[PDB]
Structure formats: C-alpha cells, structure tokens
Amino acid sequence: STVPRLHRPSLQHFREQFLVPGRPVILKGVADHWPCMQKWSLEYIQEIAGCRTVPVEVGWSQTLMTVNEFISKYIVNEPRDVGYLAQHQLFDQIPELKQDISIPDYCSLGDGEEEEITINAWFGPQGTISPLHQDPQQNFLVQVMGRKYIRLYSPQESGALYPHDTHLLHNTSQVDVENPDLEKFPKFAKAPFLSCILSPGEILFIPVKYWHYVRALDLSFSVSFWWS
Numbered sequence: 001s002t003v004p005r006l007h008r009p010s011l012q013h014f015r016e017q018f019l020v021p022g023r024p025v026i027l028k029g030v031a032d033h034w035p036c037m038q039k040w041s042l043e044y045i046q047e048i049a050g051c052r053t054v055p056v057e058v059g060w061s062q063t064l065m066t067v068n069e070f071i072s073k074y075i076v077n078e079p080r081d082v083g084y085l086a087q088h089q090l091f092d093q094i095p096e097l098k099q100d101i102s103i104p105d106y107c108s109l110g111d112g113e114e115e116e117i118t119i120n121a122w123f124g125p126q127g128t129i130s131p132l133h134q135d136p137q138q139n140f141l142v143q144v145m146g147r148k149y150i151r152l153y154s155p156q157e158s159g160a161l162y163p164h165d166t167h168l169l170h171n172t173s174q175v176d177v178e179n180p181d182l183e184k185f186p187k188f189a190k191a192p193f194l195s196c197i198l199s200p201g202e203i204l205f206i207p208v209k210y211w212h213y214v215r216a217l218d219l220s221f222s223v224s225f226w227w228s
C-alpha cells in the first residue's frame with residue numbers, strides 16, 4: 001500500500017505516530033516554499049555550481065568532473081552511461097546553495113546535534129537507481145526537481161531481502177526490486193512494502209534502518225538530511 005501524506009503535522013504528532021514507532025510518512029506543506037523549489041533550474045545550477053568538481057557515479061565506477069561536464073555528458077546530451085551525482089555534500093562545498101534550503105524543524109526531535117546533520121545532494125537524469133539498502137540514521141528526503149519512485153521495506157522484513165553477507169554490503173539487498181529473481185530469492189515475493197511517487201515539494205521520512213529503493217522517473221534533484 002501507499003505511504004501516507006500529512007500536511008505540516010505538529011512536532012508531537014510526528015514524534016508519537018512516526019518517529020518513535022519508525023513509520024514512514026510524506027510531509028506536505030513543509031518544504032513547499034523553500035527557495036530551491038522555484039530557483040533550481042539547470043541554468044541556475046550551472047550558473048552557481050558549473051565550474052565546481054563533483055563526484056559522479058557511472059553505471060560501476062566513481063569519477064570526478066565539473067558540474068558543467070556532468071550536465072553536458074549525462075543529462076542534456078543522449079548519455080552513453082547512466083551518471084549520478086549521488087550522496088555528495090554539495091551545500092558544504094557551495095554555501096551559497098544553503099540559502100535555498102532549510103533543516104526541517106522535525107529534526108530537533110532527534111537526540112543529535114544540528115551540526116551533525118548530514119545534508120546530501122542527489123542530482124541525475126531519469127533512470128538513476130539505488131539498490132535496496134538501509135542507512136544507520138533517520139532521513140528526510142526532500143524532492144526538489146522531478147519525481148522518484150520509492151519502495152520501502154521495514155527492518156522486520158530483512159530476512160526476505162537477502163542482505164549481502166560481505167560486511168561492506170551487509171546494508172544492501174541482493175535483490176533487484178523491480179525484477180526479482182524469485183528462483184534464487186523466493187521470500188522476497190511475500191514481503192509486504194510501502195511505495196510512493198515522491199514529487200517536487202514533498203518530504204519523505206525514511207525511519208532509521210528502513211530499507212529503501214529509489215528510481216528517478218524524470219530529471220531529478222533531491223536533498224537528503226541524515227539525522228539522529
């Protein structure tokens with residue numbers, strides 16, 4: 001079934017119904033009017049960040065290039081590979097971009113410091129795919145440009161997701177979510193999940209260790225906040 005959408009819930013409501021029990025939710029009316037939502041065109045991104053060097057994941061491999069090169073090679077021209085400017089602390093690198101976002105007030109319910117919140121950018125063409133994986137902190141994933149298809153599996157379902165047994169990949173499923181090998185991973189078919197299409201201005205709360213899988217449906221720009 002679908003992830004529920006709530007408009008600006010109170011801190012106490014979010015705390016009691018979603019944060020403490022660990023249940024996903026989409027927050028509406030929270031990041032709606034952040035400046036990024038109007039300002040961040042390709043042209044703007046090129047104007048403010050075009051010359052800066054960013055890590056880019058291709059395919060698999062990790063390379064470096066300028067924002068301008070990334071846009072030219074992987075977005076506007078018929079790309080030859082899938083390239084993704086993934087999990088990069090762009091706003092520490094380019095503080096002028098911090099003015100276009102905020103830290104959600106709900107982060108202040110956590111047991112951590114705001115100085116410890118990790119803000120990552122996720123910028124890429126249609127077709128970028130995460131593997132199904134879990135992270136060790138809470139997350140608000142803020143959609144700014146385009147749409148993402150996201151599937152969520154509780155940590156209670158980890159057995160049916162066949163994590164990699166290599167310690168470096170223990171947080172990642174062996175299963176291709178959208179075309180699963182059920183002859184090898186038969187328990188995956190039975191595992192209940194939530195899903196959504198996350199659209200611009202929406203925030204997805206992914207509870208700590210919730211398994212998530214993400215596919216960009218369009219040219220996409222997302223900002224995640226990892227917090228505790």
Ligand SMILES: O=C(O)c1cc(C(=O)O)c(NCCCCc2ccccc2)cn1
Pocket residue numbers: 057058059082083084086122128129130131135139141214222224
């Ligand atoms: O916010 C999160 O914690 C979060 C967000 C996303 C997201 O994509 O939005 C995500 N996906 C992983 C990227 C996979 C690498 C890759 C993919 C295709 C091509 C080359 C490289 C993981 N986690």
Ligand SMILES: [Mn+2]
Pocket residue numbers: 133134135212
């Ligand atoms: Mn993640």
